[PDB]
Amino acid sequence: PVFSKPMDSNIRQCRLKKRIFAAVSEGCVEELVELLVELQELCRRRHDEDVPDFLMHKLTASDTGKTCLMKALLNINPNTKEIVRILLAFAEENDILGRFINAEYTEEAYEGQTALNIAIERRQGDIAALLIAAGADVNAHAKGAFFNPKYQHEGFYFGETPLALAACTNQPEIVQLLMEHEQTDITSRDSRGNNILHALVTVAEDFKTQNDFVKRMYDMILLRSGNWELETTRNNDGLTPLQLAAKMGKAEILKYILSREIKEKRLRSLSRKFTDWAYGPVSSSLYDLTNVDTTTDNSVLEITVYNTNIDNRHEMLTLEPLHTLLHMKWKKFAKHMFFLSFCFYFFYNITLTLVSYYRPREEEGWLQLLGRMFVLIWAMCISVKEGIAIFLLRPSDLQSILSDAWFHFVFFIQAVLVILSVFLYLFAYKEYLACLVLAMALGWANMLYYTRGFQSMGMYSVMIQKVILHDVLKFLFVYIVFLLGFGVALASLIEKCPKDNKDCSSYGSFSDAVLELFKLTIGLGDLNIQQNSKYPILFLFLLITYVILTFVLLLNMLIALMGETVENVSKESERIWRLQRARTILEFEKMLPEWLRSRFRMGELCKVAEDDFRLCLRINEVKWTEWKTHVSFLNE
Amino acid sequence: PVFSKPMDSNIRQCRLKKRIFAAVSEGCVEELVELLVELQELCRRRHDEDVPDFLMHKLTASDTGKTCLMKALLNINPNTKEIVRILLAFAEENDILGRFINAEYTEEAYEGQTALNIAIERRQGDIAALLIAAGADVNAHAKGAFFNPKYQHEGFYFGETPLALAACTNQPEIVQLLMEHEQTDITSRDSRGNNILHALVTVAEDFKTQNDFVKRMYDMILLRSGNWELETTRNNDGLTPLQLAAKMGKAEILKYILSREIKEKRLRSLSRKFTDWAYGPVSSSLYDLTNVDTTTDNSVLEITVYNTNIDNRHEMLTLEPLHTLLHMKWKKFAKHMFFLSFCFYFFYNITLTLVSYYRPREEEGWLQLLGRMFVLIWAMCISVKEGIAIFLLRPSDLQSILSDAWFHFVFFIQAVLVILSVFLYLFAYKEYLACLVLAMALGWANMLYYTRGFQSMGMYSVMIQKVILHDVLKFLFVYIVFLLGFGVALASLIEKCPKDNKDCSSYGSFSDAVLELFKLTIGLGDLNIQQNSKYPILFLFLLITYVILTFVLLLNMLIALMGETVENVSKESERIWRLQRARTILEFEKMLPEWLRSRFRMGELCKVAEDDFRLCLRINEVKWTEWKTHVSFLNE
C-alpha cells in the first residue's frame, strides 16, 4: 500500500520545538527537564492573555497533529515511563491537561488516533492505566484510510475503538480494565456500523489453529455484557455478528455461536443450543432458528449456500442446524419438485425430437396438438424464469460459473432458439431448421443437469465443464499457432492444378488445408505423397513434422492435462454433489407460494425463560465415535 | 432418530406434585424437606385405608412412570447425594421402600429402566452402592425401542442389564460390585438372547486402537465366572460370542478368543490355545476346533469367508487356526478339484466350438458321439448346480456381485443357451444358431473364472467387472445424451436423396446416423463434407463439435476414470486372490460326500484336563521378525 506520509518519522528524506521531540524519543530525562523550563518561562514575555493556546502550539506538530506524548509512545525504550510522568505533570500547572491527553491527528489517513490508541498497541498496561485515570477518552474513534481500508492489504482494521484494539491484539487485562470503566460505551458502532463483536469476526480466521483468542475474546465480552444488544445489532449492510460469520466464511466462529450453551442460571438465557436430555452417545437438543431459517430476508442458510467467495461451504453446511434444515426440506418438497422437473423436461425433449425428425420434407390428431402447444408454452416458461436469473446476476463470473451459473445460460439459449424457430417457420423463412436443430441438440445436452446432486452421478457435469474452461480453451492458443502456420505453408506449395480432376491435391486452398490437418491431429488423416507440387520432399518433410508435433506430442499433452483435471474432481467428488443439491433445494423453495411455504415451515415455540419464547428445532443426535473415545480416558 | 417423548424434560413446548420435581432437580434441600412434610400430613385427612398406594401416585409421573428419585439422578448436581438420602429415608416410615426403588417407566420406548440404570450411567458409584444395599433390582431388564433398536443409529444397545451397562461404559469398579452380589444372575439373556459376553462383542470395534477396555471387560468377566456356560450360550439366532465376533467382523476380539491361553492352573481349563513347547522363534501349539472347523452348521470358518457385510475378511482369515485349515484343505482336495474343473470345462468349450464351426451349411464316428453327448450332459449338470445357487441367494446384491456372485449367473446363462439350442435345432426351428453361437462366445469368455485365486492372474477378472459396473454403465447416461442429440440433429439436415445412388448420404436415417457417430467416437469415422444437405456449413459445424466432445474429451475422460479403477485394484491385488481361493475351497468341500469328507477331517483328540477331551490342531509356528525384536530390548 501507500499513504504518502508516515506515522512516525526519524529519517529525513533529502529551535525549542525540535529539541523536545528529540528528547522524548531517546529518553533523555535531564535534558527534557531543562527544555521544559525554557518553555515555561516563554509564555509571559510578550502577552498574558493566551496561555492555554500558546502552550499547545509549541508541543504539537503542525503537519500531522502528533503531540510530544504520542512521540514518546511510538518510540518504546526502557526510559519511557519517566517521560510520561513529567509531561502529564507539566500540563497540571498550565491547566492544559484536558486538551493534551485528548489530542488527535489532523491528517486524513490517521485521523482520530490518540495517545491511548498507541499505548495499548505497544503493550503498555501501566501507561494506559495512567491515561484513563487522568482523563483520556475511552471512546475515541480512530478513522482514516489506514484504520478503515478497502481491502485487507491497505491498512489495519480492528474496530476503531480502544476496546476493540485490546480485543484484537490479545490483551484481556486491558479489556477488563475498560469494561469496568463506567464511561465506556460497549455497544458503540464505528464508521462501518460494526460493534465489538462484528470486529472480532472480521479479524478471525477461517479454520481451527492451536490458539484461538478470538473465540476467547468473543466469549469474555458477551458474557460480561449479559444482554442481546450486541447480538441483534446490525451493520450498515444489515448484518448481525452471526450473519457476518456466514458472509466471510469463518467456520470456527460460526460453529461456536450456533451451538452456544451456558449451563449456569443467571447466564443461561444467552444460549442458542438447549440440551433436553443425554444418555451416553444419544443427545436431544433444541437449536435457535432466529436468523438461521429462510423466513427472514438475509438468513444464515441463504448466505452460506450462495457464498461463492469462500472455500469452506462444505465445512459450514455440515454444522448443527444447517445440515438438518437442508435435509428436512429435501424430504418434504425438494425431492418432489426435482422429479417433476425431470419429467416435464424429458417430455419436452421428446416432442422437440419428433417434430424435428418428422418434418415436412418437400411438400410445403389431438395428441399432435397437445405436443406442439406444449412446446410453445414450456419454452416461454423457461425464457421468462431463466431470463430473470441472468438479469439478477453480477458480471464477476469466475466463481459462480464453476458448476452453478453455467446452466442458467444454456437453459436460456435453448429456450430462445425454440421461440426463434417459431417466428422463422411461420412467417416466410427457411432458417427455422438452423434454429430448431441446434435447440434440439442443446436440449438433449441439458439432461446432464439432472445428474447433479447425486453421489454416483454428480461429478460428471463438473468434469465436462472444468475440462473445457481450464484445459481446452487455454490450449486453442497453442494449437491455432500450428494449425494456421502449417495450413498456409502446405497450401502455398500446391501448384494450380491442370483444368480437370479436382481430386488432384487435397491441400489446394487454405480452407481445404485446415480440414485435413485437423484430421491428422485427431488421427483420421492420410499421409499422401502424390500431392502435385514442385517440392515433393519439402512437402513430405513439413507433413510428417506436423504429425509428430500435433498428433504425437500436442495431442497427448492435452490428454495428460485433462487427466489431471479428472483426478482432481474425483478426489473432491463427495463434496461436489452435496453442494449441488444445497443450491437446488433453496431455488425450489423460492418457487413456492407463501401459503404453501408456511405449511413447510419447521420449528416449534419453546419456553426458554421468563419473557423468552423463541423458535426451536429438536434434533436427536447420536455420536458413537465421539463417545467411545470420551469414555476410554476417564478410566485409563 | 425419533421417539416422540423425551427421557428428561425441562423445557416446556408451547401443585404439590410439581414442586417436588422442581426441588429434586436444582438441589434445594431446605425446600424439599418443607414439601415432604406437607405431603406426609396429606395422607390421613380423608381416609386411612390406602396409605401405600396414595403415597406413590403423588411421587410418580402419570405419563412416563418417572419417579422423583429418577428425576434427581437424571439431573446431576453437587447437591445430589443429599437428595437421595432424604427420599430413601422418606419411604421408611411410610413402608413403601420396596416399590419406590424398583419402579420403572411404563412408556413403550423406555420400559424397564430403573433408578439403578441411571445412577450407573451417570458415574455415581456411591449412589448405586446405596441402592443395591437398600433393595434395588440388579436383574432389571430395560427393554424398549431406545434400548433395543433395529440399527446402530436409533438408540443405545448395551445388553439391557445393569451388569452390561457398567461393562460397556468402562466401569469395572461397579462390575466387581455386581458380581460379588449373590442375587446377580450373570448368565442372564435379554430380548435378543444375548448374555454378558455377546453384548461386549456388539459394542466392540473392528480394529486395534490405543485403549481396548472391551477386551479387558471380556477377560475380567470370563475368568471370574470360571466355567464354559457363558461361552456355549447361543442367541435366538444360535450364535456363541465366538461366532458373533465372526459375523460382525470384530478382528481384535476374534483374535483374542481364538488364541486365549491361561498359564495358571485352577484357570488353565478355560483356554483354547495350548502351547506344547517353545525354543526361541519356534513354537508348537494346540488350537481348539470346537466351532471353528466346518463340521457344525454355523461354523466360524464358514461365517468369515461368506461374510460380505464386513471389510476385514483378509485380517480375520490370516488368524491362527483359520489360515491353516484353509491351507490344509487346498493341499488335500481343493487343488485337485480345481484342476479337473478346468479340464472338464476346457474340453466342453472345444466341443461346442467344433460343432458350431463345422455346422451343416446348406444340405439339411464314436468320437463324434462321445462329443455331442458330453455337451448334452455337462450343460444339464451346470444348469442344476448353478440354478440352486441363484435360488439360495438374497436380492441385496451390491456386496456379493463384486467378484463372487457374478459368475453364478454367467455359468447358468451359458448352460441354458446350450439346452435352448437343442430344442430349437431338433424340432423345426432355425433360431438354434442364435443360441449356439452366443453360448459358445460366452463359454470361452467364462474361462477367466479359472484365473481366479492366483497371485499373478487373480486381479484380471476383478478389473474387467469393476470397470463395467463402476465406470462404463454410469457413463452411458452421459454419452447417450450426445449420441441421441446429435443423431437426430445430423439426420434432420439430410435432404431426401434423388432416386438412385443410396451412397449419397450416410446420415440418411436415425439408425444410420447412430452408426457413423459411434465410429467417430471410437476413431473409425470419416469427416465427409460431401453430404448433400441445404446447410453444408451448419452440418460441418455440428460434425466437428461432435468429434471434439466425444472423441477428444469424453473418450479420454472415460480412460482417465478406467485408469483409476485399474490402479486401485492393482494396489489391493494381493488381498484379492487370497479371498478368491478361500471361497473356492469351501464350495468344493460342499460338493464332497459324507464318507469322503470324513477322511479329509483334520484334528486329533487331546487330554487337556480331567473330563476335558477336545479336538486340537498342532501348528508349528516360526516367527523370526517377532523374535529378533523381542530379544533386543531385554539386554539393551
Ligand SMILES: CCCCCCCC/C=C/CCCCCCCC(=O)O[C@@H](COC(=O)CCCCCCCCCCCCCCC)COP(=O)([O-])OCC[N+](C)(C)C
Ligand atoms: C410455470 C411453471 C410452474 C411450475 C410448478 C411448480 C411450482 C409449485 C410446486 C408445487 C409442488 C408442492 C411440493 C411437493 C409436495 C409433495 C410431497 C412429496 O411427496 O415429496 C417427496 C418426494 O416424493 C416423490 O415421489 C419423489 C419420487 C422419487 C424422486 C427421485 C429423484 C430423481 C429425479 C430424477 C433424476 C434422474 C437422474 C438420472 C440421470 C438424469 C419428498 O421426498 P420423500 O419421498 O418424502 O423422502 C423420503 C422420506 N420420508 C418418506 C420418510 C418422509
Ligand SMILES: CCCCCCCC/C=C/CCCCCCCC(=O)O[C@@H](COC(=O)CCCCCCCCCCCCCCC)COP(=O)([O-])OCC[N+](C)(C)C
Ligand atoms: C472450444 C472451441 C474449439 C474449436 C474452436 C476453433 C475454431 C477455429 C476454426 C477454424 C476454421 C477456419 C476456416 C477458414 C475460412 C476461410 C478463411 C479465409 O478466407 O482465408 C483466406 C486467406 O487465407 C490466409 O492467408 C490466412 C491468413 C489469416 C491471418 C490470421 C490472423 C489472425 C489469427 C490469430 C491467431 C494467432 C494468435 C496467437 C496467440 C498465441 C483463404 O481463402 P480461401 O480458403 O482460398 O477461399 C476461397 C475463395 N473463394 C471462395 C472465392 C474461391
Ligand SMILES: CCCCCCCC/C=C/CCCCCCCC(=O)O[C@@H](COC(=O)CCCCCCCCCCCCCCC)COP(=O)([O-])OCC[N+](C)(C)C
Ligand atoms: C456331476 C458332477 C460331479 C463332479 C465330480 C466331483 C465331486 C467328487 C470329487 C472327488 C475328488 C476327490 C478329492 C481329490 C483327492 C485327490 C488328492 C490330490 O492329489 O490333491 C492334490 C492335487 O494334486 C494335483 O493333481 C494338482 C495338479 C496341479 C493343479 C494346478 C492348479 C491349476 C488348475 C488350472 C488353472 C489354470 C490357470 C490358467 C488360466 C485359466 C492336492 O494338492 P497337492 O498336490 O497335494 O499340494 C502339494 C502339497 N503336498 C504334495 C506336499 C501334499
Ligand SMILES: CCCCCCCC/C=C/CCCCCCCC(=O)O[C@@H](COC(=O)CCCCCCCCCCCCCCC)COP(=O)([O-])OCC[N+](C)(C)C
Ligand atoms: C454396457 C452397454 C453399452 C452399450 C449399450 C448401449 C445400447 C444403445 C443402442 C442404440 C442403438 C439404437 C438403434 C435404433 C433402432 C431404431 C429406432 C427408431 O425407430 O427411431 C426412429 C425415430 O427416431 C427418433 O426420432 C428418436 C427419438 C427417440 C426418443 C428417445 C427417448 C428415450 C431416450 C432416453 C435417453 C435419455 C436419458 C437421459 C438421462 C441422462 C427412426 O426410425 P428409422 O431409423 O428411420 O427406421 C426406418 C423405418 N423403416 C425401417 C420402415 C424404413
Ligand SMILES: CCCCCCCC/C=C/CCCCCCCC(=O)O[C@@H](COC(=O)CCCCCCCCCCCCCCC)COP(=O)([O-])OCC[N+](C)(C)C
Ligand atoms: C459410453 C462410452 C462412450 C465412448 C466409448 C464407446 C464404447 C461404448 C459405447 C457404447 C454405446 C453403444 C452404441 C452402439 C451403436 C449402435 C448402431 C446401430 O444403431 O445399429 C444399427 C441398427 O440396427 C438395427 O436396426 C437393430 C439394432 C441393433 C443394434 C446393436 C448394437 C449393439 C448394442 C449394444 C452392445 C452392447 C455391448 C456391451 C459391451 C460391454 C445401425 O443401423 P443400420 O443397420 O446401418 O441402418 C439400417 C437402415 N434402416 C434405417 C432402413 C433401418
Ligand SMILES: CCCCCCCC/C=C/CCCCCCCC(=O)O[C@@H](COC(=O)CCCCCCCCCCCCCCC)COP(=O)([O-])OCC[N+](C)(C)C
Ligand atoms: C485445441 C486442441 C488440439 C488437439 C485436439 C483437437 C480437438 C479440438 C480442436 C479444435 C480446433 C478446430 C479446428 C476445426 C477445423 C475446421 C475445418 C474448416 O476449415 O472447415 C471447412 C471450411 O468451411 C467454411 O468455409 C466455413 C467455416 C466453418 C468451420 C466450422 C468448423 C467448426 C468450428 C469450431 C467447432 C467448435 C466445437 C467446440 C467443442 C468443445 C473446410 O473447408 P472446405 O469446405 O472443405 O473447403 C471449401 C473449398 N473452398 C476453399 C472453395 C471454400
Ligand SMILES: CCCCCCCC/C=C\CCCCCCCC(=O)O[C@@H](COC(=O)CCCCCCCCCCCCCCC)COP(=O)([O-])OCC[N+](C)(C)C
Ligand atoms: C421418465 C418420465 C417420462 C415423461 C413423459 C415421456 C413420454 C413421451 C411419450 C410420447 C411423446 C409423444 C407425444 C407428442 C405428439 C406428437 C408426435 C409426432 O410428432 O408424430 C409422430 C408420431 O409418433 C411416432 O410415430 C414416432 C415413433 C418413434 C418414437 C420412438 C419411441 C420413443 C419416444 C416415445 C416414448 C417415450 C417414453 C418415455 C418413458 C415413459 C410422427 O410419426 P409418423 O407416424 O411417421 O407420422 C407421419 C409424419 N410424416 C408424414 C411427416 C412422416
Ligand SMILES: CCCCCCCC/C=C\CCCCCCCC(=O)O[C@@H](COC(=O)CCCCCCCCCCCCCCC)COP(=O)([O-])OCC[N+](C)(C)C
Ligand atoms: C515448426 C515450424 C517450422 C518448421 C521448420 C523450419 C526451420 C528450418 C530452418 C532452416 C532450414 C534451411 C534449409 C531449408 C531451405 C531449402 C529446403 C529445400 O530446398 O528443399 C530441398 C529438400 O527438402 C528438404 O527436405 C529440406 C529439409 C527441411 C529443412 C529443415 C532443417 C532441419 C530441421 C529439423 C527440425 C524439425 C522441425 C522442427 C521441429 C522441432 C529440395 O528438395 P525438393 O523439395 O524435392 O526440390 C527439388 C528441386 N530443387 C533441388 C532444385 C530445389
Ligand SMILES: CCCCCCCC/C=C\CCCCCCCC(=O)O[C@@H](COC(=O)CCCCCCCCCCCCCCC)COP(=O)([O-])OCC[N+](C)(C)C
Ligand atoms: C488342458 C486339458 C485339456 C482337456 C481336454 C482337451 C482335448 C480336446 C481334444 C479333442 C476334442 C474333440 C472331441 C469332440 C469330437 C467331435 C469333433 C467334431 O466336431 O468333428 C470335427 C473333426 O475334428 C476336426 O477335424 C477339427 C480339426 C481342428 C481342431 C483344432 C485343434 C485344437 C482343438 C483340439 C485339440 C485340443 C488339445 C487341448 C490340450 C490337450 C469335424 O471336422 P471335419 O473333418 O471337417 O468333419 C467334416 C464335417 N463337415 C462335413 C461339415 C465339414
Ligand SMILES: CCCCCCCC/C=C\CCCCCCCC(=O)O[C@@H](COC(=O)CCCCCCCCCCCCCCC)COP(=O)([O-])OCC[N+](C)(C)C
Ligand atoms: C452441444 C449441443 C448444442 C450445439 C450448439 C448449439 C448452441 C448454439 C446457440 C446459438 C446459435 C444461434 C445462431 C445459429 C442459427 C443460424 C445458423 C445458420 O443459419 O447457419 C449458417 C452458418 O452455419 C454456422 O456455421 C453457424 C454456427 C453455429 C452457431 C453456434 C454458435 C457458436 C457456439 C460455439 C460453441 C461450440 C458448441 C458447443 C460446445 C461446448 C448458414 O450457413 P449454411 O449452413 O451454409 O446455409 C447457407 C444458407 N443461408 C445463408 C440462407 C442460411
Ligand SMILES: CCCCC/C=C\C/C=C\C/C=C/C/C=C\CCCC(=O)O
Ligand atoms: C447466445 C448464444 C451464444 C452462442 C452459444 C454459446 C454457448 C452455449 C452453447 C453450448 C454450450 C454447452 C454445450 C453442451 C456441451 C457440453 C456440456 C454438457 C453439459 C454439462 O456441462 O454437463
Ligand SMILES: CCCCC/C=C\C/C=C\C/C=C/C/C=C\CCCC(=O)O
Ligand atoms: C438371461 C440372459 C440375460 C442377458 C444376459 C446378460 C448378461 C450375461 C452375458 C454376458 C455377461 C458377461 C460377458 C463377458 C464379457 C466380459 C467379462 C469377462 C469375464 C470376467 O468377468 O472376468
Ligand SMILES: NCCOB(c1ccccc1)c1ccccc1
Ligand atoms: N447425507 C448427508 C450428507 O449431508 B449433506 C451436506 C453436507 C455438507 C454440505 C452440504 C450438504 C446433505 C445432503 C443432502 C441434503 C441435505 C444435506
Ligand SMILES: NCCOB(c1ccccc1)c1ccccc1
Ligand atoms: N419455470 C419453468 C420451468 O421451471 B423449472 C426448472 C427448469 C429448469 C431447471 C430447473 C427448474 C421447474 C421447477 C420445478 C418443477 C418443474 C419445473
Ligand SMILES: NCCOB(c1ccccc1)c1ccccc1
Ligand atoms: N500363501 C499364504 C497366503 O495366505 B492365505 C490367506 C490369507 C488371508 C486371507 C485368505 C487367505 C491362503 C491362501 C491360500 C490357501 C490358504 C490360505
Ligand SMILES: NCCOB(c1ccccc1)c1ccccc1
Ligand atoms: N456340477 C457340475 C460341474 O461343476 B463344477 C464347477 C463348474 C463351474 C464352476 C465351478 C465348479 C465342477 C466341480 C469340481 C470338479 C468338476 C466340475
